[PDB]
Amino acid sequence: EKGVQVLLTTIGAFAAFGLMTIAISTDYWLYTRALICNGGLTHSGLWRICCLEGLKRGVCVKINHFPEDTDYDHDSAEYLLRVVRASSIFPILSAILLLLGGVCVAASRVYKSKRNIILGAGILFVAAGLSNIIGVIVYISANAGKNHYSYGWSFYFGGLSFILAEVIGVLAVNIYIERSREAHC
Amino acid sequence: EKGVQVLLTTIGAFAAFGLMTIAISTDYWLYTRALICNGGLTHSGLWRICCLEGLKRGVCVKINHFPEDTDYDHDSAEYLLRVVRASSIFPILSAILLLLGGVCVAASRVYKSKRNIILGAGILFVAAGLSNIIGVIVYISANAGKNHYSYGWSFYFGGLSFILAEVIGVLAVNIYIERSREAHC
Amino acid sequence: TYIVTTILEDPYVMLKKNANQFEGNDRYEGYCVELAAEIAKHVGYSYRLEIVSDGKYGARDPDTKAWNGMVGELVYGRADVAVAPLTITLVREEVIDFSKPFMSLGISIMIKKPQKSKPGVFSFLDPLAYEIWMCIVFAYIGVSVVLFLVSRFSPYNEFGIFNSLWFSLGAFMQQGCDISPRSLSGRIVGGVWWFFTLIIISSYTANLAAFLTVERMVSPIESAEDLAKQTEIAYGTLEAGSTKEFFRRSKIAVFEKMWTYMKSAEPSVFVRTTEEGMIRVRKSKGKYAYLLESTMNEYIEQRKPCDTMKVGGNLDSKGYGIATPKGSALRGPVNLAVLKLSEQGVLDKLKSKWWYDKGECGDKTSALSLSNVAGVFYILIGGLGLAMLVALIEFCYKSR
Amino acid sequence: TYIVTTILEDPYVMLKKNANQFEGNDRYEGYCVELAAEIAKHVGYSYRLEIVSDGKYGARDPDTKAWNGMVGELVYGRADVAVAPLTITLVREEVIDFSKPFMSLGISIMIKKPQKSKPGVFSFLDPLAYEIWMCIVFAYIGVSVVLFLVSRFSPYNEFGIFNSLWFSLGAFMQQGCDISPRSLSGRIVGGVWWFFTLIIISSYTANLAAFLTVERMVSPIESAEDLAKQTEIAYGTLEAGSTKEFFRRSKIAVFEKMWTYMKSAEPSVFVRTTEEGMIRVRKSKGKYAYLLESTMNEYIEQRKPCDTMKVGGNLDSKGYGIATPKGSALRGPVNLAVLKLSEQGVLDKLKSKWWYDKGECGDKTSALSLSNVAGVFYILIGGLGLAMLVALIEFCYKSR
Amino acid sequence: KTVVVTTILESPYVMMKKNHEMLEGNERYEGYCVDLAAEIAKHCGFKYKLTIVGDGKYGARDADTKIWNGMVGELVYGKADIAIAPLTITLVREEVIDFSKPFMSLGISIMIKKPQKSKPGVFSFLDPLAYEIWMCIVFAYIGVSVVLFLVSRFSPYEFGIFNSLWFSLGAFMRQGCDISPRSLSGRIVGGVWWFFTLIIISSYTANLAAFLTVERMVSPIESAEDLSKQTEIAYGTLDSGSTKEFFRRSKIAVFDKMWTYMRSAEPSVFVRTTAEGVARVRKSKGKYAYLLESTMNEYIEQRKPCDTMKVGGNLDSKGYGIATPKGSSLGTPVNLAVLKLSEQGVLDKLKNKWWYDKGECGAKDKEKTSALSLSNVAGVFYILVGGLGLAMLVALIEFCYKSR
Amino acid sequence: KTVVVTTILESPYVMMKKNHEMLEGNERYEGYCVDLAAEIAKHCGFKYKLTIVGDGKYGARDADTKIWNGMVGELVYGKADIAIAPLTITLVREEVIDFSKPFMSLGISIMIKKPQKSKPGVFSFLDPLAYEIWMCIVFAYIGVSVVLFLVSRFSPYEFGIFNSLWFSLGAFMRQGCDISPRSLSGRIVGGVWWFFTLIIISSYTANLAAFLTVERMVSPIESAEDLSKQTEIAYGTLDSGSTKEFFRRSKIAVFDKMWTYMRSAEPSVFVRTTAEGVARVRKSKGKYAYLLESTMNEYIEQRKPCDTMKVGGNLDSKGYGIATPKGSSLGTPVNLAVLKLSEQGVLDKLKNKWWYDKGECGAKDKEKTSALSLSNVAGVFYILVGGLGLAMLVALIEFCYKSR
Ligand SMILES: CCCCCC/C=C/CCCCCCCC(=O)O
Ligand SMILES: N[C@@H](CCC(=O)O)C(=O)O
Ligand SMILES: N[C@@H](CCC(=O)O)C(=O)O
Ligand SMILES: N[C@@H](CCC(=O)O)C(=O)O
Ligand SMILES: N[C@@H](CCC(=O)O)C(=O)O
């Protein structure tokens, strides 16, 4: 229950990180009709859009996250959104925090002295979760700015990533409370 | 506090009854323009409508609570409303209960043996209250079935009647709880 | 033998079960085929059923003063008789004479009005987009976990992961709160979640109000005037027919306006054949309406699936009479037949039988129906099911 | 001396401070009076200002081919000149010649659009009638007292009259519950009060939605087409004037429709005098609109209280020119003056000064403004006041 | 000889002028039919005199007597040479009197008074949700309470049947309850019930918003078939008229039933005159509806007070033609006049001005919403006072039980 | 001699036909002005030849050169006998070229692209209540908490500043709070705050319902004065045209400022052709607006894609008359033709068919509402995640403080 928890945390932490890294790298985030190739069924991703059954088949082009718009500046809402969409800093931050948590959960094993070792691991995992939610929101909002769009498997990985990221966060909290209760009394 | 309460109850019970009886008898319930006398400013009452500054001045006619309507029967919603409006059984019931409470509060003085004497007095007073509210509702609903209408002083007596009727009901409850606590222990 | 020109349009003329197997008159089975047989018996005159090459009710060329289809075949004299649903028009009466009408007619409007679309289970979720619902779920998980962490962040606070999940679910529904955050860090989480809940619930309520308002203020077309006024609806009539000519010559202001629009409508609203008109209506889902004689509207309603219905009533009195070349010898006998066969009632019975036997189909509250909110009831019953199942799991666990 | 016929209509002609004290030309002070003086100086021709008996811009009698008012006085030759805002019409040009126009004109629409009505404090209570509010108060007293009685009906229940009043007030607001009825008799009271609260709150919300929707979907008149389409608005024009004649002869379909309606409008929309038109607009509160030359619309807007404004822009180009009998000797000099005085800029400056000096008055969000919900804030601050006052009363009582 | 014209006085076909008493000759009657008669007179080159039939019923033939009355009666007797009155072209009439090609054709319509949104009933507050939803909410409420009770007693973490009923009732009204499910199995029940309550309350609020925004008033008889089935509104036709005859001879079962019933109705639903029919409708407030030709329905709607309206598709199309005695000399010229005037479109223009251009109504059609009056929400107050009554009654029952 | 007509190609006055290349003569151009020219030709009894000025700008005079170009330039040189192009009647033009009475008069209008309801912003959820209400709600919230605190500490029946702040925040969100005021003085504060919260929440819900029901889109420049003040949208006129000249010579301060600015703008807001102006508007998406005669605005709106609209009252009325060389022989016949055609109303009928009857738009005008997209409510999610962030940050601050 206590020892298995720590194993599940670590096992899950890498699985969550794995899903996020697969998601970020994969180009199957959204299936939609795109003018790119000749109203074409396209598997668009977080980073690159790959067309299917259009002008080409399997062709992958880097997406333009800054087209010719009405609101463009250094400080504009329309711009600042697209900046964050293009950068995908939130999806990435999630993975960095998941990895850094994956370090901190490992560090908690060797350094039982520091109860605050696992505390951090959890805090990171929850934050990684929050980051993911922003990441999903910024993405959906940017995609919007009726053509049918269906979220592909890559997105749902990022969805599943969050669910895990939250869960390992819960476990991390439980472990901290256990280790603190061991130090207590 | 305890003895004064009983005096306030009795004093109030007759005042509440008085307001209700004045209200029922008075013909100043509603000031409105009526076709009766020649779009005329009229002080209509619960029972009789008296015209002013029209064909006549001071003329009082018994109101027709059953005009030529679309829904008329032995059992119809439109009818059953008008029946209750015309009868004004609820305004009257209030006064009967207020009076019967006025008896029961008097009976509570001579028969201290029966704690249930005042209990009844209160129950009656609250019921008299409820009756009043139906009485106000049925009246307003029936009047409706934009010509300006303003509720005259007679109505507000019936309004003030309820407020008292409730209050004497509260006092009656307090007295019962006091007398029961005296019997208790 | 008299060659009879007749358009193939059900129920007046329908192709028999096997087009290969049936030949001559036996090829076609229709009310007009039955009526032609009755005329043939009464007048003692042999008839040959054919379909005109042009396959049009009729046309007027102003330059040439020439008719087309059934009218054209009678004008040229190539077809000896027309036993067909051809409206008796002033323009037609001058070129080819008409017998007394067998049946009354009117210009009517055919639209797919009775779509009778099922609301569908999980239509209660329609006012908020699927992504909002999914983000609400993420937000719900996010808040609970964050509330749990902040409550347990500093060692000794009654908020376990399960109690935090409950508090959050309680706050979003707004129905209840078992417990309330005491910590500043906690109260911030709750405070902001409470704000999120208020705006989303209010958003949902509002937008659901928008949906139910706009679907209560839409008026289905009730009049020809209504049809003309609406730009979004495209009423269409057969490219070549008596109705198309009537609208062109129509002296009525509302009708002249409606006719003018047809010329100035893109894509062109005129349809070559009846079936093409019917398909155009079904594909448009009422974005395009069809103008045709009330008789054919009646049959389309009777025939499954009753997709197209009638709007208002017939615009104007029309009649279909037997058409022959002006001063033909055949005209006199067919005119007398139109009276004898009508009084016989055989003609009337044939029309009654054809519509009634074919007929497959033979009541509005604005109040929300059980179907509109059905999904919520299904979820409730499903939840009660799952709850019982989980109760038995807890009961079994408690024993061991 | 040339007798000049001029209508008394501000700002062109306004009566001087003391009508008794001022006589002849000094009696009238206006832009047209100033303009007449300038014409008199330039042409070196003595002028006498009078007001025509008829007091009409002009009329056409088809039977007699006779004009009335200023036009009539020039046609008969009784009045030697017309220095007035008389529009140069084709019909007028044939009977009496016109000089080059001093100022441009257009047919405009005058309505009391800027009413700018204050919502008022205690407008938040508008969606529910006063009787409902008063009955809610009675119901609130009724429920609390009944809850108190049922709780204390049988001797030993934490519901005192004050706690019952609190519970009831808590339930109606839906914000909180200190305590909850445990007795069957109690739970019935609460149960039914809870139902009452849900329906009234929901009623209030709904009806307030209705009010704010209907006052967001009402479009103020933006075009002449809009005016013609709306039946409820009655646009009116002067009984006798160039604009009234223009609308009668107007070849434009929308204008012919608008003109036809004026004849078929009850009560009659035509008004004898400008002031009568202005008063009719103010009494109608926009149920009646006024059609007049854009110049006079401009002055009514400039003049306090700016009740009437302009809708869209001017329908059509018009001009006011000096009117003389066709081939009068006076015509030639006044035509040359209309150019000399325009180039001088004195005429233009007089028009600018008259409008600007008179002028008293010189921005829409659908969002609810503080004013709309002001009453609720006043009640809040009043409550906090009363609360503090009651707190001090409790503090003083606690000491003794 | 001057041609005597038998024209019935029915606006807008024939209207008596304001000063028709002062006026003499054909001047007294001004109408579409008067204009049409003048046009016929010009093409025929025959002087015409406007006259009104005493009865004013265009056709009346007793089956026993077999003698026509009204316009038909004046042609049969030969006293009137010509009829510009809009006589319906019927088979029975066609055999007795020669008929010109119809100047106008119109269907048999239904005239009913406009529906009233007045007098919102008690329990009008329950209108936004259908009765089956309300009944299912009650079933759902019982279902949830019982399931919450069972799970709580079978798998304890208390929730008695009465406490579970209270919790559920508390949750539906969005009122907080101090008791809360603690068990996972319990919290699922509560959780899903809470979801059900939020959507229904929100649905109710929304739909009630829809109703109060947009007023749609239900037509009492939407169609003729509906009218016959319900029998809620009595249906009447001109006591002596083509409409009364057509219904009698009608081969349709629903029409035969309607004819039998109208013939077998006391008091008589049959009316002497059009005007009598219109007044009967207004006095009945929709207890009586009127069957008349769509043309007169159209102008009756256009004329104030804009209350009587045309409902449903026309029962059948009927033409109106210039009527002459059988084999009349006038017949041929008038038939050619009708054809000439139809090609000219003069008839259509005359109809347009009289029928719609008059604009007595102006075809008037999101009026400022009214604050809810105590009537609209009266039911909820009645339920409240009833509940308080029942509560007190149950309190006294508990008090009496506690003593013994 | 055949009269050379200098007509600019601007629809609907002049449109090149589908097969105008195949066609020869005047057949290539079909327009209102072509129809009008034909009418003038018939009254004058003079053969006319349709021609287009090379420049296509009706007036161009350099102030230094003082030489006219376009239609004016063809009349000055005498190469074109007559101009059916709609030349504006201006004082400067009137002195150089003889002008017939205006066939049509139209005002100087503003053409802008239609406003877009797309891209709901973050904090769009706060739109139904004005910013001052939100700020006053915050003040009210602080007011209530502080007053509840003071009354609780001064007249005790606990409510600390932090607990009072929590109670108030709890009450505004309609979320139940375990702590409740017990004192009369306290319960008044809570009681009235509860009333405030119920009305505001209900107000917000209602008004948000209004917004989502009824879409009204704000015009970027509602009036010309507004446009000049904001400077948000650049305003442009025909580089060489009556509109550019009128603004320069305009004695109005706002107009002089607008003229100076347009003249002093880089890149040039002045456009070579009408079509160039229309395209510039569409590419700018309302960053650039167009000033042109209301007539061309009208037909540009009627032509697809129905995006460019007419905003505000016309800046001033301008007439368009048949233009001839100073003292031309053609001048008199054409002036009489304009007067004859105006009385006939032929001109008005021609304008009606071309301007509105074409119905390319059909003047299209409660479309089915769209489910709220995450964008519309995005702000509330951002606030939520921001709050959770801040909460965690404050939790760690409390954790660090607890250690030391
Ligand atoms: C204790 C804090 C309460 C704050 C009260 C806020 C409201 C005050 C009354 C506003 C009246 C409406 C007009 C005000 C004009 C304005 O500020 O725009
Ligand atoms: N059925 C009509 C044609 C109807 C139409 O044009 O759609 C005829 O007989 O000519
Ligand atoms: N001012 C106009 C009259 C306007 C009107 O008829 O209202 C004129 O000079 O005749
Ligand atoms: N005009 C009809 C009477 C009116 C009617 O019943 O419609 C007839 O000749 O019988
Ligand atoms: N027709 C104008 C040019 C177009 C305009 O600027 O409106 C002229 O003659 O100058």
Residue numbers in the entry:
A (entry chain J), B (entry chain I): 16 to 53, 79 to 185, 196 to 235
C (entry chain A), D (entry chain C): 390 to 545, 565 to 770, 778 to 815
E (entry chain B), F (entry chain D): 393 to 549, 570 to 777, 781 to 819
Please give the exact wording used by the authors of the publication that reports this structure.
AMPA-type glutamate receptors (AMPARs) mediate rapid signal transmission at excitatory synapses in the brain. TARPs are principal AMPAR auxiliary subunits, comprised of three groups; Type-1a (γ2, γ3) and Type-1b TARPs (γ4, γ8) are widely expressed, generally slowing gating kinetics, increasing agonist potency and reducing channel rectification by polyamines. Here, electron cryo-microscopy structures of the GluA1/2 TARP-γ8 complex, in both open and desensitized states (at 3.5 Å), reveal state-selective engagement of the LBDs by the large TARP-γ8 loop (‘β1’), elucidating how this TARP stabilizes specific gating states.
Cryo-EM data processing indicated that not only open states (L-Glu+CTZ bound) but also desensitized receptors (L-Glu only) were present on the same EM grid, enabling a direct comparison of both states after classification and refinement procedures. Desensitization, on the other hand, involves D1 interface rupture, which relieves LBD tension on the linkers to close the gate. In the desensitized state, D1 interface rupture separates the LBD dimer by 28 Å between GluA1 Ala737 and GluA2 Ser741, but is mostly unchanged between resting and open state (17.7 vs 17.4 Å). The open-to-desensitized transition is accompanied by a large rotation of the GluA1 LBDs while GluA2 undergoes smaller, more local rearrangements (average residue movements of 24.5 ± 0.7° for GluA1 versus 14.7 ± 0.6° for GluA2). This is due to the GluA1 D1 lobe driving most of the D1 interface rupture upon desensitization in addition to closure of the D2 interface, leading to a rotation of the whole GluA1 LBDs. In the desensitized state, a predominant ‘elongated’ β1 conformation facilitates robust interaction with the GluA2 D1 lobe, proximal to Lys410. We hypothesize that the γ8 β1-D1 contact stabilizes the desensitized state, by slowing recovery out of this conformation. The conduction path of the desensitized receptor closely mirrors the resting state with the gate shut. Densities also locate to the constrictions of the gate but these are only apparent in desensitized and closed state structures, implying that these binding sites disappear upon gate opening.
